[PDB]
Ligand binder design. Sequence first.
Ligand SMILES: O=c1[nH]cc(NCCc2ccccc2)c(=O)[nH]1
Length: 165
Amino acid sequence: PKEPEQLRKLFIGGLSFETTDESLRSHFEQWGTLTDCVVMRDPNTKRSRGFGFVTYATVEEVDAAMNARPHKVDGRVVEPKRAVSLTVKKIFVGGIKEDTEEHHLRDYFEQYGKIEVIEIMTDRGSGKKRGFAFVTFDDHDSVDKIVIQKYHTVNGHNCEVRKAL
Ligand SMILES: O=c1[nH]cc(NCCc2ccccc2)c(=O)[nH]1
């Protein structure tokens, strides 16, 4: 059945004040079926608040829209982000124990986004692996996709993954 609506929504910040529900829809419909599309406006002046939301029919359509950034809507580059579950590019990965290596984390996480840093944590005194790591991506959407999954399995371990600093 249908993925939860919260996971199919994109907040679109930085809109041109001239963007309307119709022009926002016409833009974002290029990447999927939109079940909802709203420009936030002042209740008295009707002047745009400079942000809005679009809701796609599926998560894969959200991915397609995010993969097509940068989006220029009505002449202005906007800022799409998945709805809340801050905006960061780094994750903590725990529960990897002592047998998990860089390539294990790379091979798994590279399908969420472009990796810039993998840091497998070792003990300051002994050099032994401590069983957690940090992965830094080039962009926040990778992290946003990662942290909404219920499960992450890497090197046979069920991992705890959260946003880092
Ligand atoms: O490479 C990294 N190593 C460690 C990190 N943890 C943040 C340290 C901290 C967390 C909570 C309170 C105070 C300090 C990090 O973000 N990146």
